[PDB]
Amino acid sequence: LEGESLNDLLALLLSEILSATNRGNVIARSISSLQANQINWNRVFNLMSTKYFLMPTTASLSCLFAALHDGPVIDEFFSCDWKVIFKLDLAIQLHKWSVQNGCFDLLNAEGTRKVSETIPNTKQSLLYLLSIASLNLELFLQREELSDGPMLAYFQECFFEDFNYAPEYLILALVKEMKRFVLLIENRTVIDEILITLLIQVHNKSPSSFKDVISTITDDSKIVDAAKIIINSDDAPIANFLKSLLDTGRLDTVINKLPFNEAFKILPCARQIGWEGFDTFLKTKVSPSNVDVVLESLEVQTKMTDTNTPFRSLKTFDLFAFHSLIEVLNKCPLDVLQLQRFESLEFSLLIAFPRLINFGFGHDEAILANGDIAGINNDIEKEMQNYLQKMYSGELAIKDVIELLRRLRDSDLPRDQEVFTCITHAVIAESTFFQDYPLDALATTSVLFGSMILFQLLRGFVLDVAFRIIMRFAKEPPESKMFKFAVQAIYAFRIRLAEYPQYCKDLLRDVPALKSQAQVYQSIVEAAT
Amino acid sequence: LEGESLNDLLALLLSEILSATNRGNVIARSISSLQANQINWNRVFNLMSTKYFLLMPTTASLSCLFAALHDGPVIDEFFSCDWKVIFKLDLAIQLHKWSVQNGCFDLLNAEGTRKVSETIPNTKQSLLYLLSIASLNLELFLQREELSDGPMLAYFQECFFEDFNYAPEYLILALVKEMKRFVLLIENRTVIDEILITLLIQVHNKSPSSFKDVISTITDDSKIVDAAKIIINSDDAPIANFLKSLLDTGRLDTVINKLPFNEAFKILPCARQIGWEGFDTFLKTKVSPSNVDVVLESLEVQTKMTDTPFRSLKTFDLFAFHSLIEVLNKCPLDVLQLQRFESLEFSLLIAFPRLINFGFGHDEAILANGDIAGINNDIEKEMQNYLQKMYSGELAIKDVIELLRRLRDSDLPRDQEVFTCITHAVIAESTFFQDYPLDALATTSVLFGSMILFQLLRGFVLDVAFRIIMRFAKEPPESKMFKFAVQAIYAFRIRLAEYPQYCKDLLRDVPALKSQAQVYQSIVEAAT
Numbered sequence A: 001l002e003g004e005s006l007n008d009l010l011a012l013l014l015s016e017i018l019s020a021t022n023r024g025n026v027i028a029r030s031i032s033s034l035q036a037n038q039i040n041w042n043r044v045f046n047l048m049s050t051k052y053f054l055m056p057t058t059a060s061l062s063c064l065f066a067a068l069h070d071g072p073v074i075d076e077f078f079s080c081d082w083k084v085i086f087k088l089d090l091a092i093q094l095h096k097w098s099v100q101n102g103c104f105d106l107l108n109a110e111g112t113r114k115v116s117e118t119i120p121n122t123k124q125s126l127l128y129l130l131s132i133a134s135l136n137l138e139l140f141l142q143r144e145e146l147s148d149g150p151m152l153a154y155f156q157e158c159f160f161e162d163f164n165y166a167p168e169y170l171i172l173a174l175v176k177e178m179k180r181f182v183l184l185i186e187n188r189t190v191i192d193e194i195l196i197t198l199l200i201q202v203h204n205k206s207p208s209s210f211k212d213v214i215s216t217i218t219d220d221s222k223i224v225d226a227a228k229i230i231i232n233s234d235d236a237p238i239a240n241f242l243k244s245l246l247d248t249g250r251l252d253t254v255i256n257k258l259p260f261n262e263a264f265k266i267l268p269c270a271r272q273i274g275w276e277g278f279d280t281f282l283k284t285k286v287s288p289s290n291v292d293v294v295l296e297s298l299e300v301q302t303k304m305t306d307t308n309t310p311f312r313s314l315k316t317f318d319l320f321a322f323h324s325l326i327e328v329l330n331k332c333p334l335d336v337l338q339l340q341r342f343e344s345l346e347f348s349l350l351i352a353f354p355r356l357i358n359f360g361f362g363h364d365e366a367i368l369a370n371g372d373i374a375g376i377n378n379d380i381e382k383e384m385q386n387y388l389q390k391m392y393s394g395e396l397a398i399k400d401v402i403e404l405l406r407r408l409r410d411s412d413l414p415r416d417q418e419v420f421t422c423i424t425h426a427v428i429a430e431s432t433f434f435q436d437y438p439l440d441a442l443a444t445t446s447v448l449f450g451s452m453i454l455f456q457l458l459r460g461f462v463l464d465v466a467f468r469i470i471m472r473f474a475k476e477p478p479e480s481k482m483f484k485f486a487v488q489a490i491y492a493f494r495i496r497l498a499e500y501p502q503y504c505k506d507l508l509r510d511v512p513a514l515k516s517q518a519q520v521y522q523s524i525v526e527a528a529t
Numbered sequence B: 001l002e003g004e005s006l007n008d009l010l011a012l013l014l015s016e017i018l019s020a021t022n023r024g025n026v027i028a029r030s031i032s033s034l035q036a037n038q039i040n041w042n043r044v045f046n047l048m049s050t051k052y053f054l055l056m057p058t059t060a061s062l063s064c065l066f067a068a069l070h071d072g073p074v075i076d077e078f079f080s081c082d083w084k085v086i087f088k089l090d091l092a093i094q095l096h097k098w099s100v101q102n103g104c105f106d107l108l109n110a111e112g113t114r115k116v117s118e119t120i121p122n123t124k125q126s127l128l129y130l131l132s133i134a135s136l137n138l139e140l141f142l143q144r145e146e147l148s149d150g151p152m153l154a155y156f157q158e159c160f161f162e163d164f165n166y167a168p169e170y171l172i173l174a175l176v177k178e179m180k181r182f183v184l185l186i187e188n189r190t191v192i193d194e195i196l197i198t199l200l201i202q203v204h205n206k207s208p209s210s211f212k213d214v215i216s217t218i219t220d221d222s223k224i225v226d227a228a229k230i231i232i233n234s235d236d237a238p239i240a241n242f243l244k245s246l247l248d249t250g251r252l253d254t255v256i257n258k259l260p261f262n263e264a265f266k267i268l269p270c271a272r273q274i275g276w277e278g279f280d281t282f283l284k285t286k287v288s289p290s291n292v293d294v295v296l297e298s299l300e301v302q303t304k305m306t307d308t309p310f311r312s313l314k315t316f317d318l319f320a321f322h323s324l325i326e327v328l329n330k331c332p333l334d335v336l337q338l339q340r341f342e343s344l345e346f347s348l349l350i351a352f353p354r355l356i357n358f359g360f361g362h363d364e365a366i367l368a369n370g371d372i373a374g375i376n377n378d379i380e381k382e383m384q385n386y387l388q389k390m391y392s393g394e395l396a397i398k399d400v401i402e403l404l405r406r407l408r409d410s411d412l413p414r415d416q417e418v419f420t421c422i423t424h425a426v427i428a429e430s431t432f433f434q435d436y437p438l439d440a441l442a443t444t445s446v447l448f449g450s451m452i453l454f455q456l457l458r459g460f461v462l463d464v465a466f467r468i469i470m471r472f473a474k475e476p477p478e479s480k481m482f483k484f485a486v487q488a489i490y491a492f493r494i495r496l497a498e499y500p501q502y503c504k505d506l507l508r509d510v511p512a513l514k515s516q517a518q519v520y521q522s523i524v525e526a527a528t
């Protein structure tokens, strides 16, 4: 039997849906006896649709698929336009599929369309089959336009399960078939929103697929929308995610297109990952309208300790970044409170990340060879300590230490540059305690500090720190350890006072008590030039 | 001139204590030319203090008096003499303003002065290194309240606060060394104790490198413990060196046991990491149902911690965790405490996967992979591909089970690691079974069950597995979790007989089992 007469195996399949066992299987086996490509199945299926009957279960469908047997035929069965109730039923019954109880093995039917031609089906999900994935998406996107039965809700539990088990397949299908779904719903932003939920969800469950999903998406509006949510939602670490954006070349776009201050949050980990659009980011993005964000961030990074915070390498800038940030920050037009906060921060920053001190004079390779924020080894701390106390015990002259530091500041040997860092840092951090010092130790420290300013061992921002400290002590009551320290330090660098007339005018303005310190006062007023 | 009439250089020294530039250190140079040991100086100073003032010397004049005396023993002799209080006060105050660079007598280089230690060097270049001066200050300050309040007392007090910040190690060394004398002076144990504890805490904050040394000299552990109780609560972490200092001086075990509980528990991981050695006995002795909410809380927190910093110091090693589980299931837990604890065994094995096969005689192997470190990527990847092969047809479940059974008893670290990884992966994946397609779910169900059957899951981990299977079994029939419980239970049915209590529970609490004929049969068969 052939042709349109033959096409009434439509009836065979139709009853093989209708409720049978004994004869059902010989029916499927008999239809399978056919050469499928020489049958016009469109006719058969549309025939089933048109003249309706004379709800399938997994057993029945299983025999329908056994009858059809060929992946292209099965796909054809799916693409036929069924009553929504039947499609809902079909999807629901496939969610209950098991080969182990003897259902037809669809996953092994050759020539079905896949949600991906690259990604293998590791999840072992029927949603790998594009027909099925798209069935589910098609039903789900239409949720509201459908009758609410028991089956609607049941399907919703099914899809929620699918959404948890294999969202990568759901999203690969949503993209591969996107024209269709946009045209079906006739609302692009519903497709967009569902797309973003999916993307976020592929990140949460099964991140090993994320890159692969990202690959197939063009509009980066979506990826940014998703990244924005992933950022605030997740507690850290997000590294793999950022590395997947980098590896697919979407990361820079996300950092720049993300709202500011979410971007800034993730800037340190982006760098450890290899991002390297940072200085451009600073130049373009950093404005006086957002600076308070930057200050908040850096303050926080200084308060972090390797034992207070989970990662900190990925939460803290490297020396190069901190450096760049300091430069730009003293360049931006900060208001008064913002500048007080910033200067405060430069001190907190120098205390927190001491390798910053000598950074940016062209010895950086040597500096960085000791680590960025890692913290100084105990033997260098101990050596620096021995050196210093030996100065305080009279054995070494101040100018000896000064000579040493002056050698080390220009050294390319990492341990050198490190010892420099430790010594200078030590003095500066120790500045909070000068007011408790006996007068001899205080005088020695005062001359050491001052000479550090004289011989140019403190430069850049570190020198402004120094100057602000000296100023801050100068503003303390005279005859006080702090005031005596200010005075002696200033005297100790006096030969170079000529280079900072502004500073001298500020000392003269704001420290009247200087009028009682003869030699120094004279030196400072001579800085009217 | 000799004798008592010589002892009337009381007059000379007395004049130097009064304010010219020229004459003063001529007098000084003259007096110093004498041989110091031959003079009876006690008599001299006594005379100086009795027919006396013809009060409040200048720093220049004091420097002159020291230049006159020159000798450490003589100088000490000058300090010990009992002078008026206003003089003692002016004396401490002028010493606080000492400068050798401004030309003051160099007191620190005088030979044969009494120090605060004969061991510790004067690294701080403090006059408080000299026991006479340290003690002078302690003496004045301990008497704050009972002394007339002038401007001198206030001045001095501010000096002492500077000393308190600069060199507390010297003040406390001196307080202990002369402890008898100060006890006699105050006659209040609580004042000496308050000051001692305060000093000790202060040595910890500034100059911690001195702490161990200070701690050596103290016999009473009561104060060390008090101080440590303050230090623990006040500081945010880390305390490592501090505890190490207590261990090296043998006060650590004492402090852990004499500290209030729950502070003590907080510092237990770091203590062990340092080498403490008393954890066993601590658990056995101190853990009571009134304090277990603290143990539970601390353990939960440890589970939720992510590498909450570098956590090595905040987190127990595997041996401690194991011990804690053992002890906790032996304690009379409340209902809520029970829920919590079991939930905790799960969260625990999720967070510390090397716990799984721990304590069966393979621990060295396990521990060679790290304690809490986290499984290497090569292992996760290998393990993943392996398991996958099982889920798509290639490997039979009994193959995986055979392998695991092999690795369970292995002393090779990596075998034990792979085991940890596969088993942990299945269990951690348990939260997601309700999303599994039926075939994958069935395979996992049989794998899990067989894990129970062939004794891959033992001890507390077995109790976890059973609690999971049970919890899934209470879910409505035809639901995925229920089908999972059923298939798992079925897959170990042969060993059901080994667990009558479990079977009876299954029979009482899960009526729906009566609908799976095979399994129901086996369970009542195993009900004895």
Ligand SMILES: [Au+]
Pocket (backbone or CB within 6 Å): none
């Ligand atoms: Au035929």
Ligand SMILES: [Au+]
Pocket (backbone or CB within 6 Å): A029, A030, A033
């Ligand atoms: Au046939």
Ligand SMILES: [Au+]
Pocket (backbone or CB within 6 Å): A062, A063, A066, A102, A103, A104
């Ligand atoms: Au079939």
Ligand SMILES: [Au+]
Pocket (backbone or CB within 6 Å): A058, A059, A062, A101, A102, A103
């Ligand atoms: Au079936």
Ligand SMILES: [Au+]
Pocket (backbone or CB within 6 Å): A163, A197
């Ligand atoms: Au959804």
Ligand SMILES: [Au+]
Pocket (backbone or CB within 6 Å): A207, A208, A210, A211, A240, A241, A244
């Ligand atoms: Au990822």
Ligand SMILES: [Au+]
Pocket (backbone or CB within 6 Å): A217, A218, A219, A222
């Ligand atoms: Au798109």
Ligand SMILES: [Au+]
Pocket (backbone or CB within 6 Å): A236, A237, A238, A265, A266, A269, A314, A315
């Ligand atoms: Au982060």
Ligand SMILES: [Au+]
Pocket (backbone or CB within 6 Å): A238, A239, A268, A269, A270, A272, A273, A314
């Ligand atoms: Au990172």
Ligand SMILES: [Au+]
Pocket (backbone or CB within 6 Å): A283, A284
């Ligand atoms: Au700009």
Ligand SMILES: [Au+]
Pocket (backbone or CB within 6 Å): A288, A289, A290, A291, A292
């Ligand atoms: Au602003």
Ligand SMILES: [Au+]
Pocket (backbone or CB within 6 Å): A399, A400, A401, A402, A403, A404
């Ligand atoms: Au020099």
Ligand SMILES: [Au+]
Pocket (backbone or CB within 6 Å): A381, A422, A423, A425, A426
């Ligand atoms: Au330092």
Ligand SMILES: [Au+]
Pocket (backbone or CB within 6 Å): A343, A344, A347, A465, A468, A469
């Ligand atoms: Au500052």
Ligand SMILES: [Au+]
Pocket (backbone or CB within 6 Å): B021, B022, B023, B024, B025, B026, B028
């Ligand atoms: Au003289």
Ligand SMILES: [Au+]
Pocket (backbone or CB within 6 Å): none
């Ligand atoms: Au003579």
